[PDB]
Amino acid sequence: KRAIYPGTFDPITNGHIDIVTRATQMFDHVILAIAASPSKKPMFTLEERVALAQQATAHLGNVEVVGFSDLMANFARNQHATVLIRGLRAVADFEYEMQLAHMNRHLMPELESVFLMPSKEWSFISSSLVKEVARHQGDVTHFLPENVHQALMAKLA
Amino acid sequence: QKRAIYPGTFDPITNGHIDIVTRATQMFDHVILAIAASPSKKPMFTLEERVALAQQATAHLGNVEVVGFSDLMANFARNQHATVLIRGLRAVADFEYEMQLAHMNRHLMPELESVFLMPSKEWSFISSSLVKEVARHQGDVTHFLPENVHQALMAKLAV
Amino acid sequence: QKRAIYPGTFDPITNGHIDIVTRATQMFDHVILAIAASPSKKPMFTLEERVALAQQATAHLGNVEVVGFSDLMANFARNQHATVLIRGLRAVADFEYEMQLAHMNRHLMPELESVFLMPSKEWSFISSSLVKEVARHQGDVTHFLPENVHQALMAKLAV
Amino acid sequence: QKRAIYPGTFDPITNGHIDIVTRATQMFDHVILAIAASPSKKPMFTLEERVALAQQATAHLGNVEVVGFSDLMANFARNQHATVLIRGLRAVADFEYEMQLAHMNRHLMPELESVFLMPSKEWSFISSSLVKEVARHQGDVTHFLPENVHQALMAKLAV
Amino acid sequence: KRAIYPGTFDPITNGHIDIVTRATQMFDHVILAIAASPSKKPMFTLEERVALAQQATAHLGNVEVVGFSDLMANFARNQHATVLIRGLRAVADFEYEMQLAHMNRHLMPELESVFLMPSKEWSFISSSLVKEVARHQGDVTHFLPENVHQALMAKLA
Amino acid sequence: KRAIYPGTFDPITNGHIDIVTRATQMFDHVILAIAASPSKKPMFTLEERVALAQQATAHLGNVEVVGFSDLMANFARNQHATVLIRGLRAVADFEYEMQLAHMNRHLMPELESVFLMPSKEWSFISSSLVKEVARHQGDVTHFLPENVHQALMAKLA
Ligand SMILES: C=Cc1cncn1[C@@H]1c2ccccc2C(=O)OC1(C)C
Ligand SMILES: C=Cc1cncn1[C@@H]1c2ccccc2C(=O)OC1(C)C
Ligand SMILES: C=Cc1cncn1[C@@H]1c2ccccc2C(=O)OC1(C)C
Ligand SMILES: [K+]
Ligand SMILES: [K+]
Ligand SMILES: [K+]
Numbered sequence: 001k002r003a004i005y006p007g008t009f010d011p012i013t014n015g016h017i018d019i020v021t022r023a024t025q026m027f028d029h030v031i032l033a034i035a036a037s038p039s040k041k042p043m044f045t046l047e048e049r050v051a052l053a054q055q056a057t058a059h060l061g062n063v064e065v066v067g068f069s070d071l072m073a074n075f076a077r078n079q080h081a082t083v084l085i086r087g088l089r090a091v092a093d094f095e096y097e098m099q100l101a102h103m104n105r106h107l108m109p110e111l112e113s114v115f116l117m118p119s120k121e122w123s124f125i126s127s128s129l130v131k132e133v134a135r136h137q138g139d140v141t142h143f144l145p146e147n148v149h150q151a152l153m154a155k156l157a
Numbered sequence: 158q159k160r161a162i163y164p165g166t167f168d169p170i171t172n173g174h175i176d177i178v179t180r181a182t183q184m185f186d187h188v189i190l191a192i193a194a195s196p197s198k199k200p201m202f203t204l205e206e207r208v209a210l211a212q213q214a215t216a217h218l219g220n221v222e223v224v225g226f227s228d229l230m231a232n233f234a235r236n237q238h239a240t241v242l243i244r245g246l247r248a249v250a251d252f253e254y255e256m257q258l259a260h261m262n263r264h265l266m267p268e269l270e271s272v273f274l275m276p277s278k279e280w281s282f283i284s285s286s287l288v289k290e291v292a293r294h295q296g297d298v299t300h301f302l303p304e305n306v307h308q309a310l311m312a313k314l315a316v
Numbered sequence: 317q318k319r320a321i322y323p324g325t326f327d328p329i330t331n332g333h334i335d336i337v338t339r340a341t342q343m344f345d346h347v348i349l350a351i352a353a354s355p356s357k358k359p360m361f362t363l364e365e366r367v368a369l370a371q372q373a374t375a376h377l378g379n380v381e382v383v384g385f386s387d388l389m390a391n392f393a394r395n396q397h398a399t400v401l402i403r404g405l406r407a408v409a410d411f412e413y414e415m416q417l418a419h420m421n422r423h424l425m426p427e428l429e430s431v432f433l434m435p436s437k438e439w440s441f442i443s444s445s446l447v448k449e450v451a452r453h454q455g456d457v458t459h460f461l462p463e464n465v466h467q468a469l470m471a472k473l474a475v
Numbered sequence: 476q477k478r479a480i481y482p483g484t485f486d487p488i489t490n491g492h493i494d495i496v497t498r499a500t501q502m503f504d505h506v507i508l509a510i511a512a513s514p515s516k517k518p519m520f521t522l523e524e525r526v527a528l529a530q531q532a533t534a535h536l537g538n539v540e541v542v543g544f545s546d547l548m549a550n551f552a553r554n555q556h557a558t559v560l561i562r563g564l565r566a567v568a569d570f571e572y573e574m575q576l577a578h579m580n581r582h583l584m585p586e587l588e589s590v591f592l593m594p595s596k597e598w599s600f601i602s603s604s605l606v607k608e609v610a611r612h613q614g615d616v617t618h619f620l621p622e623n624v625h626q627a628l629m630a631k632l633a634v
Numbered sequence: 635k636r637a638i639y640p641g642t643f644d645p646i647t648n649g650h651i652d653i654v655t656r657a658t659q660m661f662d663h664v665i666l667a668i669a670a671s672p673s674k675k676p677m678f679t680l681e682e683r684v685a686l687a688q689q690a691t692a693h694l695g696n697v698e699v700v701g702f703s704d705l706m707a708n709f710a711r712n713q714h715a716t717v718l719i720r721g722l723r724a725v726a727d728f729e730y731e732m733q734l735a736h737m738n739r740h741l742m743p744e745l746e747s748v749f750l751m752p753s754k755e756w757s758f759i760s761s762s763l764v765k766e767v768a769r770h771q772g773d774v775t776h777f778l779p780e781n782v783h784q785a786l787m788a789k790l791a
Numbered sequence: 792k793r794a795i796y797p798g799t800f801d802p803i804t805n806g807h808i809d810i811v812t813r814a815t816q817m818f819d820h821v822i823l824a825i826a827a828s829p830s831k832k833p834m835f836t837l838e839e840r841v842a843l844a845q846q847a848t849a850h851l852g853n854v855e856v857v858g859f860s861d862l863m864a865n866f867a868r869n870q871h872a873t874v875l876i877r878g879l880r881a882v883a884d885f886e887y888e889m890q891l892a893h894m895n896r897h898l899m900p901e902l903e904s905v906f907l908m909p910s911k912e913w914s915f916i917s918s919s920l921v922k923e924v925a926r927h928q929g930d931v932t933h934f935l936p937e938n939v940h941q942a943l944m945a946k947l948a
């Protein structure tokens with residue numbers, strides 16, 4: 001049983017770590033798939049984001065971090081995944097996640113989207129929010145893996 | 158080896174509910190469709206009727222076990238050695254209640270993980286409540302129900 | 317030639333409801349304000365009282381016909397040769413229920429099209445429920461009701 | 476000099492409610508925790524029980540006065556010379572009802588300003604309703620309640 | 635009775651066709667009005683979008699496709715329309731549609747906004763979503779008129 | 792008792808005037824704090840926005856208009872404020888305001904976020920909406936202070 005947790009992870013946060021850890025307690029192999037998402041003008045390069053996530057997830061034995069620029073449905077097929085994992089935060093993410101999952105269902109009917117709910121600790125953060133706080137030299141230590149907080153400060157210097 | 162519970166009132170089970178258990182059977186080894194007595198909700202069908210309707214409507218699914226329960230849902234999942242809790246996600250108003258509910262279940266049973274599945278567009282606007290409402294007012298609900306459930310619902314409304 | 321039905325409980329009719337039918341009379345040739353008995357809701361006013369209050373409060377509108385009905389709303393719209401179904405949109409929680417409702421009505425009567433009108437900012441936060449709640453607790457609701465309806469509501473609460 | 480009222484059913488008071496009054500005591504000179512009888516809601520605890528539980532659970536707060544009231548909330552705030560109306564904001568479904576409610580209170584008492592405080596993440600998914608539901612079904616609710624309230628809730632459910 | 639269905643239509647989708655078809659069963663003349671919307675950086679030019687929509691709607695006798703860069707209220711007056719049609723998809727579109735309709739009511743009180751609900755088939759697609767799927771060479775045949783799908787592939791080649 | 796009403800105010804609207812006026816009836820001193828927000832590409836410069844807001848609020852004795860580019864929590868501390876005021880319009884603003892307030896609570900626990908509700912009159916406008924209407928030469932007289940409407944037309948000429 002193979003599941004994919006896709007996202008921009010720009011950068012990966014403790015909310016993302018929360019979700020991927022719950023996915024490893026539930027599925028045999030989880031692929032943390034980092035979308036290139038160049039339309040989003042990500043702060044970190046795909047190679048940067050893959051490196052940050054690999055280091056931030058190394059203590060989790062059954063997580064494989066991979067970058068990709070493909071269509072999600074094609075990449076899920078090529079990875080032999082039948083489960084797509086997405087974290088559910090708020091009502092505005094939810095409605096977009098539904099359009100997404102229905103689109104992914106259209107493109108790959110046997111690829112099933114499942115939504116996990118993060119801990120309350122991370123229920124109000126996002127990559128975007130942490131980055132804006134860090135641009136104003138605010139403390140984001142609590143929201144990020146050490147390697148990621150270390151790298152985020154270096155990139156904003 | 159992964160044991161998943163899909164709990165609910167199933168008053169009666171609908172094609173949306175069938176959609177959800179069928180997707181859950183494709184992900185987990187054993188799925189327990191747990192029918193809560195929910196005496197608080199004053200159900201149209203008895204718990205045995207709901208179990209019977211749910212059993213025959215899921216009978217073609219090899220790894221579904223239809224079971225009733227009157228315990229607190231977390232207390233039942235613990236006793237069933239279930240680690241996955243299945244919930245179907247319809248609209249945003251379901252979402253907000255599901256979130257409170259899942260945080261409560263996590264407090265009560267941290268090792269029980271709540272999982273949200275998404276129904277087909279076909280069933281994304283029906284509920285047991287609405288279907289019953291339409292049938293109480295002589296509206297056609299055949300499209301939303303298993304055949305065995307449509308006959309029990311028709312038979313129940315004649316009297 | 318276009319026949320539109322605006323159904324609801326109207327328990328009692330409010331200035332928000334008047335806002336909606338008045339905008340509907342500017343778009344369609346004949347508007348049927350259909351008062352559902354909604355015995356399920358245990359209404360404060362009787363169906364004849366609601367019809368009477370609604371008739372006089374809409375009497376200045378030439379193409380409004382106030383009618384009661386106890387059928388399923390789609391069954392009534394079919395028999396009235398109505399092809400437009402008017403619903404007033406208040407807030408997002410109305411929206412989610414209106415969407416399920418309209419998909420149900422489309423299943424039951426495809427040729428009946430559901431249309432959503434938007435009330436004035438003035439009435440975008442009132443409902444029959446809230447107005448009644450405030451008046452049961454001796455609050456001023458004069459601003460939200462037609463004069464004839466405010467007197468029936470005052471008279472109904474004295475006893 | 477600023478007098479603030481925090482009204483509600485408090486059936487029973489929870490740690491979310493304590494969170495809100497405690498933040499309100501840090502902003503306003505005197506906070507009135509107003510316990511509405513809400514006979515409409517068929518409360519689990521009597522009004523005197525709710526006042527007593529709320530008094531001891533807030534007793535460490537110097538500028539909190541726990542008071543019961545059966546008037547319309549605006550009528551009570553007027554008589555208490557309160558100009559700030561405290562409401563706790565949980566999720567989006569609370570928001571939509573709070574907005575209608577606050578516009579109503581502004582109509583009834585323009586000089587009473589509604590203020591929305593945000594609870595801790597800890598209590599952002601609990602309510603009196605859900606806690607009671609879990610405890611009626613033999614679930615652990617110790618984490619969500621003041622100690623004095625957990626004993627009254629345990630004692631109330633034994634019989 | 636004259637109604638306007640305005641939008642960016644970048645490009646027009648089967649959801650848009652759904653809504654405009656329902657409007658023609660309800661009103662005598664419907665003007666599918668394509669807003670230039672240069673703030674949105676549309677993928678297709680206004681002339682491209684007007685051509686695509688004209689061809690995609692030709693089988694509907696009482697639809698007139700027009701482009702415009704005016705203020706909506708002025709354009710509705712100049713077209714002798716008293717009805718503004720908008721399709722309602724999700725909760726996040728809804729709140730914006732309300733600010734819009736109230737603004738349009740302020741500018742032209744007799745111009746009434748009416749909201750139609752698309753079929754479940756199109757309740758989870760958008761121009762944006764289809765375009766992103768097509769950028770990754772995903773099948774969007776089901777969501778578009780043939781001429782529009784044909785043109786969307788050519789523009790992404 | 793010192794409260795801060797922060798925002799982009801690009802430009803300040805009658806909804807903003809509504810909220811700040813309610814804050815002055817409730818707190819002793821209100822600081823209308825204008826965030827530089829260069830990520831938003833504001834139409835008016837920070838100096839322009841501060842000038843517009845000062846003039847638009849001059850009749851309110853206990854409002855001090857200030858611009859800032861700092862972290863909100865640091866600026867609130869430096870102004871000796873313990874109250875952060877935000878206006879609540881719709882469900883989509885609400886969820887973002889929660890992530891914000893929880894972030895600000897993390898950074899400054901004693902800085903309490905409080906939400907005021909504007910009048911129905913301004914419950915459907917935004918700086919963004921007014922600006923788009925003014926770009927199409929639409930009447931925005933009703934939504935803005937005179938000095939701000941006067942300046943908005945000049946900037947769009
Ligand atoms: C980012 C996560 C994701 C999950 N599902 C799809 N996505 C993306 C997406 C968005 C919208 C349309 C298509 C796609 C797509 O096919 O791939 C993407 C990975 C780029
Ligand atoms: C795109 C559809 C639409 C429907 N109603 C208005 N719009 C647009 C708009 C958005 C926001 C403010 C003003 C306007 C406006 O006046 O015209 C636009 C056509 C550009
Ligand atoms: C604009 C109002 C505001 C209120 N609270 C914070 N903000 C902004 C913000 C957004 C997101 C992350 C950090 C911040 C921040 O620290 O300062 C900003 C002023 C730039
Ligand atoms: K998340
Ligand atoms: K649409
Ligand atoms: K505002």
